[PDB]
Design a protein around this ligand. Structure first.
Ligand SMILES: *[C@@H]1O[C@H](CO)[C@@H](O)[C@H](O)[C@H]1NC(C)=O
Ligand SMILES: [Ca+2]
Ligand SMILES: [Ca+2]
Ligand SMILES: [Ca+2]
Length: 428
């Protein structure tokens, strides 16, 4: 089982254990004894596998030094809260010393046993539930189910093998639960597969999660937040979304470089379904959504609001200085046997940055002339890479800017009116 560890004291040469109603260091360390096996769980609690309880100290009426004890993990009136960085020091401190220990005949770092990592090595990570009745809320670890404590996900209580967790600490009381995410290359359960491609989709209509939690939820399933890379993809999504009413997080965000738009996965931004007046509120709303209200259009929203979200996975997978309009800046490339330049890589971008361009604006082969905000190279190559300018493409004011420039020093692009007279670059 992952994330279970023994706690080894170098000073006292032994492992922490819980047994017989005591907490103590035993010189015989055994990785297979439940009394010696610990796990970090939620709310900074340290769970013992053999006792099924959490390490703590009390609040007695006698206001005096504390000692270690084991407690039912739902008793949060007590001090059940530790911190992995200071835990070793506090174990030593609270273990104390008997007079026998400091008066012997003849006149201490703690670590995971084995690997010898620090006690922060195996932190607890929240696990967002899938479907269930909990709207995606993380597992409550540990939880009680049929009078037993579980320190992780379990198939107990189900016949179908699917691992699940409670989303409170007592399922019998509350009956709130969800499935645990699984990493797999199959799309059969909790997924839908586009059969025309390798893509699998999960529309979690009933979940309410922040964009970051939704990102993590898709990550824990071996997937990523939806990226819409192609008119084909937006078409499938629109078909699937017909008849629903929902607003869902997708992988689009400007978070890193303000205004720089990107998929959370690495897909190029060659396709934009922004709604009419969106993006608005640039410093405010940093994360994209898709909405049925707009027949599949995209808005940006404050990333902390709780929304449903879509997960996706694909398991089976020289210059011309003469100023002219973009249009037949291409004609000048075609005659001469070439085409306006396409860029498939950041190196090919830098290949062209200082070398060919040599200090300002100029045309490349990227254009949306055929379908608005679906960008293609004029030389017909795959659009596998894009370097845009924050807020671009735009269509400044409401006006068609159907052709792309290199405006700026470092090679980032912009969509501008195709009749602006500018230099160009060709390739063959
Ligand atoms: C750990 O306990 C098992 C009994 O379950 C025993 O067979 C084994 O030898 C023990 N390991 C050590 C190092 O004492
Ligand atoms: Ca908005
Ligand atoms: Ca355009
Ligand atoms: Ca523009």
């Amino acid at each position: 089982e992952p994330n279970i560890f023994l706690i080894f004291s170098h000073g006292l040469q032994g492992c922490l254990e819980a047994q017989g109603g005591q907490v103590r260091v035993t010189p015989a360390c055994n990785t297979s004894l439940p009394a010696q096996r610990w796990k970090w769980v939620s709310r900074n609690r340290l769970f013992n596998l053999g006792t099924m309880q959490c390490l703590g100290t009390g609040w007695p009426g006698t206001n005096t030094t504390a000692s270690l004890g084991m407690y039912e993990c739902d008793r949060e009136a007590l001090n059940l809260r530790w911190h992995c960085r200071t835990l070793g020091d506090q174990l030593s401190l609270l273990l104390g010393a008997r007079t026998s220990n400091i008066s012997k005949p003849g006149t201490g770092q703690w670590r995971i046993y084995g690997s010898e990592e620090d006690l922060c090595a195996l932190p607890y990570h929240e696990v967002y539930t899938i479907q269930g009745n909990s709207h995606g809320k993380p597992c409550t670890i540990p939880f009680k189910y049929d009078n037993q404590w579980f320190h992780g996900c379990t198939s107990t209580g189900r016949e179908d093998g699917h691992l699940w967790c409670a989303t409170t600490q007592d399922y019998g009381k509350d009956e709130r639960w969800g499935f645990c995410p699984i990493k797999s290359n199959d799309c059969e359960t909790f997924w839908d597969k586009d059969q025309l491609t390798d893509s699998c989709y999960q529309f979690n209509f009933q979940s309410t999660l922040s964009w970051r939690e939704a990102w993590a939820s898709c990550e824990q399933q071996g997937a990523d937040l939806l990226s819409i890379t192609e008119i084909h993809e937006q078409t499938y999504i629109n078909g699937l979304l017909t008849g629903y009413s929902s607003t869902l997080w997708i992988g689009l965000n400007d978070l890193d470089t303000s205004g720089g738009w990107q998929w959370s996965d690495n897909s190029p931004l060659k396709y934009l379904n922004w709604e009419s007046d969106q993006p608005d509120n640039p410093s405010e709303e940093n994360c994209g959504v898709i909405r049925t209200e707009s027949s599949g259009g995209w808005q940006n929203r404050d990333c902390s609001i709780a929304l449903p979200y879509v997960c996706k996975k694909k398991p089976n997978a020289r210059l011309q200085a003469e100023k002219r309009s973009w249009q037949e800046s291409k004609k000048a490339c075609l005659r001469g046997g070439g085409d306006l330049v396409s860029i498939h890589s950041m190196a090919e971008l830098e290949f062209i940055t200082k070398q060919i361009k040599q200090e300002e604006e100029l045309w490349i082969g990227l254009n949306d002339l055929k379908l608005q905000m679906n960008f293609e190279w004029s030389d017909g190559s795959l659009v596998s890479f894009t370097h845009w300018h924050p807020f671009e493409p735009n269509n400044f004011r409401d006006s068609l800017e159907d052709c792309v420039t290199i405006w700026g020093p470092e090679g980032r692009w912009n969509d501008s009116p195709c009749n602006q007279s500018l230099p160009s670059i060709c390739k063959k």
